Design a protein around this ligand. Structure first.
Ligand SMILES: *[C@@H]1O[C@H](CO)[C@@H](O[C@@H]2O[C@H](CO)[C@@H](O[C@@H]3O[C@H](CO[C@H]4O[C@H](CO[C@H]5O[C@H](CO)[C@@H](O)[C@H](O)[C@@H]5O)[C@@H](O)[C@H](O[C@H]5O[C@H](CO)[C@@H](O)[C@H](O)[C@@H]5O)[C@@H]4O)[C@@H](O)[C@H](O[C@H]4O[C@H](CO)[C@@H](O)[C@H](O)[C@@H]4O[C@H]4O[C@H](CO)[C@@H](O)[C@H](O)[C@@H]4O)[C@@H]3O)[C@H](O)[C@H]2NC(C)=O)[C@H](O)[C@H]1NC(C)=O
Ligand SMILES: *[C@@H]1O[C@H](CO)[C@@H](O[C@@H]2O[C@H](CO)[C@@H](O[C@@H]3O[C@H](CO)[C@@H](O)[C@H](O)[C@@H]3O)[C@H](O)[C@H]2NC(C)=O)[C@H](O)[C@H]1NC(C)=O
Ligand SMILES: *[C@@H]1O[C@H](CO)[C@@H](O)[C@H](O)[C@H]1NC(C)=O
Lengths: 110, 126, 52
């Protein structure tokens, strides 16, 4: 019962779409559709990015597209700028009222 | 506007206990859950159990049972977290986060929708 | 086909009526006889529970 899988780091140029995904056990992500993503700049508290697999929270523009397929939860990044240098985190329901968080991604802007 | 404030940064020694108090202001906090997360500097987040400010039910994650207690105080709108038996790798930052909505009809405890967060507190040991 | 459901009030799964709401009773003069109302259209009902 360890953390959910996540790639170590991502990189890319501004202006295009960047894909990130979490895979896990079907008892965690494959059985329940309660998966959310988090963005954390280093220095203060993170901010909520997405409620469901896809329904937008208030104060966030349509730039962050989420989806779920099988056991893969994917977030795609459209239109990168300098305000994206942060960390991206999975979290999901796991049964027995437990929440499992993801591993962590480092994003560098080229 | 609602706010979540915490205690100061704590320095400790292994084999002790630590109190962290999270205070919520600006809204009726008894209708919303309260989750706790921790993060060592350099690695990811992980999750402890929630507290329900209506009745007093409490869950916990694994490797925390018999080690951590959570307490309400509804008079001044705050939640206490006691963590005992500290060891060397517990140096981290702690955040208290608002959970779902208690609605008297569904188990909304495990809905990972943390929208408002505290500033976090830094607890270190030597 | 008869479904042997058990219900005190508010009859569950069963055969509907044909044309309209129909009243069945023994006398309709004294108040000790249970009057049965038979409906033409059904109403959905759900009943759930938390975990054990
Ligand atoms: C059997 O039937 C019963 C019938 O009752 C069913 O029970 C009902 O079940 C549904 C869902 O299954 C519940 O709905 C949920 O309600 C919550 C609460 O929302 C209310 O409060 C909002 C907050 O405002 C109050 O609180 C502040 C706090 O200070 C006060 O200051 C205010 O003055 C208020 O008192 C309020 O904004 C809400 O308004 C919404 O609804 C009205 C209805 O008429 C609309 O007009 C509004 O425009 C607005 O839409 C409401 O009054 C909702 O918040 C829940 O939605 C959340 O969860 C969804 C699922 O994830 C999610 O998709 C939503 O986006 C939403 O997300 C929320 O997530 C976090 C929760 O903390 C936060 O980030 C944030 O708050 C965000 O909003 C949900 O809709 C009913 O409450 C419940 N009935 C009762 C009586 O409790 C039962 O399910 C049936 N059983 C079956 C079918 O088995
Ligand atoms: C309602 O209560 C039941 C009580 O059984 C919950 O079922 C239990 O859910 C947990 C979720 O973690 C299961 O644990 C998993 O077991 C598999 C078995 O191989 C393991 O591989 C996983 O790593 C994990 O430990 C547990 O087995 C399961 N109980 C049984 C008897 O199967 C259920 O989840 C509760 N409902 C909700 C919505 O949480
Ligand atoms: C029951 O019905 C009969 C005839 O249908 C009638 O004579 C009798 O008075 C009724 N009972 C009462 C209590 O009125």
């Amino acid at each position: 019962q360890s953390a959910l899988t996540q790639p170590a780091s991502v990189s890319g140029s501004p202006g295009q779409s960047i894909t990130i995904s979490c895979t896990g056990t079907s008892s965690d992500v494959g059985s329940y559709n309660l998966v959310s993503w988090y963005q954390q700049h280093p220095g203060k508290a993170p901010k909520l990015m997405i409620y469901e697999v896809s329904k937008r929270p208030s104060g966030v523009s349509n730039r962050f597209s989420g989806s779920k397929s099988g056991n893969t939860a994917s977030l795609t990044i459209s239109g990168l700028q300098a305000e994206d240098e942060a960390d991206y985190y999975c979290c999901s329901y796991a049964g027995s009222s437990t929440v499992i968080f993801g591993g962590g991604t480092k994003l560098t802007v080229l | 506007q609602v706010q979540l404030v915490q205690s100061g940064a704590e320095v400790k020694k292994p084999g002790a206990s630590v109190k962290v108090s999270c205070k919520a202001s600006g809204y009726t906090f008894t209708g919303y859950y309260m989750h706790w997360v921790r993060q060592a500097p350099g690695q990811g987040l992980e999750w402890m159990g929630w507290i329900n400010p209506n009745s007093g039910g409490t869950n916990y994650a694994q490797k925390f049972q018999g080690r951590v207690t959570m307490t309400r105080d509804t008079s001044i709108s705050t939640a206490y977290m006691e963590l005992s038996r500290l060891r060397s790798d517990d140096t981290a930052v702690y955040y208290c986060a608002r959970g779902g909505w208690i609605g008297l009809y569904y188990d909304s405890s495990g809905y990972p929708n943390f929208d408002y967060w505290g500033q976090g507190t830094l607890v270190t040991v030597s | 086909g008869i479904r042997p459901v058990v219900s005190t009030q508010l009859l569950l799964n069963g055969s509907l009526a044909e044309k309209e709401i129909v009243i069945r009773s023994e006398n309709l003069t004294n108040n000790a006889k249970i009057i049965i109302v038979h409906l033409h259209t059904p109403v959905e009902i759900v009943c759930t529970r938390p975990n054990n």
